[PDB]
Design a protein around this ligand. Structure first.
Ligand SMILES: *[C@@H]1O[C@H](CO)[C@@H](O[C@@H]2O[C@H](CO)[C@@H](O[C@@H]3O[C@H](CO[C@H]4O[C@H](CO)[C@@H](O)[C@H](O)[C@@H]4O)[C@@H](O)[C@H](O[C@H]4O[C@H](CO)[C@@H](O)[C@H](O)[C@@H]4O)[C@@H]3O)[C@H](O)[C@H]2NC(C)=O)[C@H](O)[C@H]1NC(C)=O
Ligand SMILES: *[C@@H]1O[C@H](CO)[C@@H](O[C@@H]2O[C@H](CO)[C@@H](O[C@@H]3O[C@H](CO)[C@@H](O)[C@H](O[C@H]4O[C@H](CO)[C@@H](O)[C@H](O)[C@@H]4O)[C@@H]3O)[C@H](O)[C@H]2NC(C)=O)[C@H](O)[C@H]1NC(C)=O
Ligand SMILES: CC(C)[C@H](C)[C@@H](O)[C@H](O)[C@@H](C)[C@H]1CC[C@H]2[C@@H]3CC(=O)[C@H]4C[C@H](O)[C@H](O)C[C@]4(C)[C@H]3CC[C@]12C
Ligand SMILES: *[C@@H]1O[C@H](CO)[C@@H](O[C@@H]2O[C@H](CO)[C@@H](O)[C@H](O)[C@H]2NC(C)=O)[C@H](O)[C@H]1NC(C)=O
Ligand SMILES: *[C@@H]1O[C@H](CO)[C@@H](O[C@@H]2O[C@H](CO)[C@@H](O)[C@H](O)[C@H]2NC(C)=O)[C@H](O)[C@H]1NC(C)=O
Ligand SMILES: *[C@@H]1O[C@H](CO[C@@H]2O[C@@H](C)[C@@H](O)[C@@H](O)[C@@H]2O)[C@@H](O)[C@H](O)[C@H]1NC(C)=O
Ligand SMILES: *[C@@H]1O[C@H](CO)[C@@H](O)[C@H](O)[C@H]1NC(C)=O
Ligand SMILES: *[C@@H]1O[C@H](CO)[C@@H](O)[C@H](O)[C@H]1NC(C)=O
Ligand SMILES: *[C@@H]1O[C@H](CO)[C@@H](O)[C@H](O)[C@H]1NC(C)=O
Length: 742
């Protein structure tokens, strides 16, 4: 307790740190109560917080210098790069809280039994470490005094690990968390009569439901993300005080069983296989319910009317079921607190309820996507003094009419998604007033007119998806102002003009898809200034001139990390139909059912059956990438292929077919390691296939037909795997699959 001991113990810790500048104001002839990270009371150290500092030392240093400090009551070393493992040590009787979370502690969890030296320990967070339970489950943690224990996000695989933790007693335990491991077996917390919080989620529990005994204090029960299928209703029947029940992402079946509803605030049965209709007994929860999630089940029927009495409800998730019918406009108006309404992926029908025109003052997310709704979009939505709606998802319905210009009064809008409908008219110029909008998606509609110049006022715009409409005119120069644009998709319209040279100012542009339009002029070399471009599809236009060598300037220097995480669809071209152009169509696909892709048969000549790939967008690099997709087929390009085309290691697809390209194939093609598809067919190419193409080991498809190439086909490589039709109409070429070179 002397200042001598305190300073020497604390400075001895600093003097084992690899980087001592992490504790710069810790100095030996200076009172510790003036140190950053120290907490004092009456000139005595009571707590130390060095969290989020890269200390890079072992637990042995912490136990010898800090945990032994007399009077220390708490030590917070979360995310501090403490490795090693726990061992015996002398612990201050005053220590009540120890936070060693988000570190690299290792060894068996039995190491934690030596923390019993801390006679006063009541709180222990050793989550996000690498502790394990190798071998057989035996003994006990023997930390009876703990009130809060978090062993989550470790490497604990085993059966009945919970029994080991609770073996020596759990009368004082109020909060137990063991999520994110691979624990299995039994969970008996019947003796833990003061347990208020239990989180055994994201484990490998596939047998019995936890035994909660009398359940007299349990307020929070989280068993989600396992493989449970038994009778949870009976196990929780006596739980009178339960406020949160999350049983989602399990293997439960059958109808919604009886539930304890007296105190229930949050309930999630999502991502299971429950069946039936929403039972009316749940009405008994409308006095307390603040959140409900029944998504990802096999529920059906209509939304019951008792939801009108659920006035405290702030989130109603019912998506991905077989719910049907029109929704009650009389029940929604009573949910004054509802801030999330997700009804997506069902078969609700009818017109939008006028209730929404009122709920626009409390809602942040309105998701009705992938339903059977019809009629016009509410022309009076967001008429309230303060409209808080941030996300409007109405895509993949049967909505008709015009896009209401009133939507600009939704000032807080961040995402507008009206794609896959039958909307007509123009893109309202008033949308330029949405100063916070990031996503404007309206593709597969019947929109006409031009792209509003007024989008120049939306500095926050990131995605502009307008494919498969009837838009005309040129690309408005006002988009140069939208400097955060990373995804621009304007395919299958009737647009004209040129690619403006100001495209180079869009530092964040990753995807530029302009196919099947009437764009013309030369390819702007300024495309080479786009530091983020990874997907350029210009197929089926009227572009002319030569391919500028400068496009590939940023090659190697590209680093698009911003686009990652966006739902998409890629419709591969079979090549069996001559009306279908291009390698394939990359299309945004948030909140849309792949089943409705057959709506495209009236706009696209391609066959979609069994050709649809999907996922969330994921670039193959982070910092030193190149262009991944380049399609400029079916234009009128001329000149030679710049040898800088081979500068892109990450290019998967290069489609330059159906042009007037001249010259010879530069040997640099062979440097395109990742090239899965390459065709230069229907062109004016000359010479012989560079022998360096044998470096290409990832080709699944090549087409060099309809050219004037001569000479032998490279003998090594993948060239022999391809049929002769991929080399046909080239009088000078010979060698298997063709006749051997005479
Ligand atoms: C009801 O129950 C469901 C199912 O359990 C919950 O839904 C899941 O919730 C989690 C948590 O939000 C969802 O995603 C999770 O994200 C985490 C990412 O954050 C961590 O990692 C990043 C990156 O390192 C760090 O920046 C950050 O600080 C965190 O450390 C993951 O930790 C989660 O686990 C997954 O990733 C980790 C990576 O360390 C792995 O160890 C895990 O095994 C796992 O792969 C997790 O992904 C998760 O997707 C949701 N699942 C669904 C909806 O199906 C509900 O939230 C819950 N609702 C309640 C209680 O109301
Ligand atoms: C044991 O330690 C772990 C690791 O630190 C810890 O897990 C982390 O908890 C925090 C808080 O519970 C999580 O971060 C929060 O996450 C939610 C949404 O997931 C946000 O609401 C939070 O931000 C709001 O609240 C903050 C106040 O905490 C405000 O500062 C902020 O402005 C927002 O209003 C916040 O981000 C975090 O995701 C986890 N997981 C990690 C870090 O991996 C765990 O809670 C600890 N356990 C115990 C029992 O103490
Ligand atoms: C970085 C983002 C923008 C991306 C959209 C990313 O998310 C996707 O994963 C992206 C990399 C995916 C979407 C479509 C895929 C192609 C689909 C296809 O027809 C395949 C045919 C054959 O099987 C070949 O061997 C491999 C081929 C060419 C595939 C390469 C990888 C692609 C491009
Ligand atoms: C904890 O981290 C430290 C620092 O990285 C590790 O120490 C290094 O260990 C390697 C491998 O044994 C040695 O080659 C280095 O010379 C060590 N350097 C320093 C500065 O420590 C330490 O091994 C880690 N501890 C554990 C248990 O993994
Ligand atoms: C958003 O709502 C306000 C409030 O109703 C509308 O205000 C009108 O603004 C025009 C000029 O733009 C005035 O001539 C009208 O008298 C206003 N009507 C009022 C105040 O009731 C505004 O037009 C709406 N904006 C959009 C794009 O629909
Ligand atoms: C490229 O094309 C430019 C525009 O040509 C005119 O408009 C296009 C859309 C077509 O309709 C075409 O027939 C028209 O003549 C020309 O100005 C330019 O010179 C062309 N460049 C080259 C290298 O041919
Ligand atoms: C989880 O349990 C299953 C059996 O239900 C087993 O096959 C699987 O290997 C286990 N996985 C783990 C512990 O990661
Ligand atoms: C879903 O509900 C609708 C409307 O009641 C019904 O026509 C349809 O067959 C149901 N689908 C399934 C798979 O049960
Ligand atoms: C959608 O609604 C229309 C009436 O507007 C109805 O005829 C049709 O069957 C509905 N489709 C589904 C799948 O419920």
């Amino acid at each position: 307790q002397s200042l001598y001991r305190e300073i020497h113990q604390l400075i001895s810790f600093k003097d084992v740190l690899p980087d001592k500048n992490l504790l710069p104001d810790w100095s030996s002839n200076k009172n510790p109560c003036t140190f950053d990270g120290v907490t004092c009371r009456d000139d005595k150290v009571t707590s130390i917080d060095l969290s989020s500092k890269p200390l890079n030392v072992g637990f042995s240093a912490v136990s010898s210098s800090l945990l032994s400090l007399t009077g220390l009551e708490s030590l917070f070393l979360s995310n501090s790069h403490i490795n090693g493992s726990v061992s015996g040590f002398k612990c201050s009787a005053s220590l009540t809280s120890l936070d060693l979370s988000r570190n690299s502690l290792s060894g068996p969890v039995t190491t934690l039994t030596s923390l019993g030296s801390c006679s006063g320990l009541k709180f222990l967070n050793v989550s996000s470490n690498t502790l394990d339970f190798p071998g057989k489950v035996s003994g006990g943690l023997k930390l009876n005094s703990l009130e809060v224990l978090d062993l989550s996000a470790n490497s604990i695989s085993g059966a009945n690990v919970v029994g080991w933790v609770l073996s020596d007693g759990c009368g004082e335990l109020k909060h137990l968390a063991i999520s994110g491991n691979k624990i299995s077996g039994d969970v008996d917390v019947s003796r833990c009569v003061n347990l208020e919080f239990l989180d055994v989620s994201s484990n490998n529990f596939s047998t019995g439901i936890p035994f909660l005994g009398d359940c007299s204090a349990l307020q929070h029960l989280d068993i989600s993300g396992n493989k449970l299928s038994g009778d949870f209703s009976r196990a929780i029947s006596t739980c009178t005080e339960l406020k949160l029940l999350n049983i989602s992402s399990n293997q439960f079946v059958g109808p919604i069983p009886p539930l304890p509803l007296k105190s229930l605030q949050y309930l999630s049965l999502a991502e299971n296989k429950f069946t039936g209709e929403i039972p009316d007994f749940l009405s008994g929860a409308c006095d307390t319910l603040t959140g409900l999630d029944l998504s990802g089940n096999h529920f059906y029927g209509a939304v019951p009317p008792f939801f009108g009495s659920c006035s405290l409800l702030e989130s109603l998730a019912l998506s991905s079921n077989n719910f049907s019918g029109e929704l009650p406009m009389d029940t929604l108006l009573k949910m004054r607190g509802l801030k999330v309404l997700d009804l997506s992926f069902n078969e609700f029908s009818g017109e939008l309820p006028e209730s929404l025109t009122n709920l626009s003052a409390s809602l942040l997310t309105l998701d009705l996507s992938s339903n059977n709704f019809s009629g016009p979009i509410l022309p009076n939505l967001c008429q309230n003094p303060k409209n808080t709606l941030q996300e409007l998802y109405l895509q993949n319905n049967g909505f008709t009419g015009k896009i209401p210009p009133t939507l600009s009064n939704c000032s807080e809008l961040v995402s507008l998604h009206l794609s896959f409908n039958y909307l007509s008219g123009t893109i309202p110029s008033s949308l330029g007033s949405l100063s916070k909008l990031r996503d404007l998606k309206l593709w597969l509609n019947m929109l006409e007119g031009e792209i509003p110049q007024e989008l120049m006022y939306v500095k926050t715009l990131e995605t502009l998806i307008l494919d498969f409409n009837d838009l005309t005119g040129e690309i408005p120069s006002g988009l140069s102002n939208c400097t955060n644009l990373n995804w621009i998709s304007l395919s299958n319209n009737r647009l004209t003009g040129e690619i403006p040279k100001w495209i180079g100012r869009l530092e964040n542009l990753a995807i530029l898809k302009l196919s099947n339009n009437s764009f013309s002029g030369n390819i702007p070399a300024e495309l080479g200034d786009c530091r983020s471009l990874i997907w350029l599809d210009l197929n089926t236009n009227l572009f002319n001139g030569t391919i500028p060598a400068a496009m590939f300037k940023q090659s190697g220097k590209i680093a698009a990390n911003f686009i990652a995480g966006k739902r998409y669809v890629y419709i591969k071209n079979d090549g069996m139909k001559k009306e279908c152009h291009g390698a394939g169509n990359l299309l945004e696909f948030q909140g849309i059912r792949s089943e409705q892709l057959n709506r495209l048969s009236t706009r696209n000549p391609c066959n979609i059956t069994s050709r649809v790939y999907g996922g969330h967008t994921s670039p193959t690099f982070d910092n030193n990438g190149s262009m991944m997709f380049l399609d400029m087929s079916y234009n009128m390009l001329s000149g030679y292929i710049p040898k800088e085309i081979g500068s892109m290691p990450y290019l998967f697809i290069l489609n330059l077919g159906h042009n007037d390209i001249s010259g010879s194939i530069p040997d640099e093609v062979g440097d395109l390691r990742g090239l899965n598809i390459l065709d230069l067919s229907s062109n004016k190419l000359d010479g012989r296939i560079p022998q360096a193409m044998s470096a290409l080991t990832m080709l699944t498809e090549i087409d060099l037909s309809n050219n004037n190439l001569s000479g032998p086909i490279p003998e090594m490589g993948q060239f022999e795997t391809f049929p002769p039709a991929k080399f046909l109409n080239n009088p000078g070429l010979c060698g298997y699959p063709l006749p051997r070179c005479d």
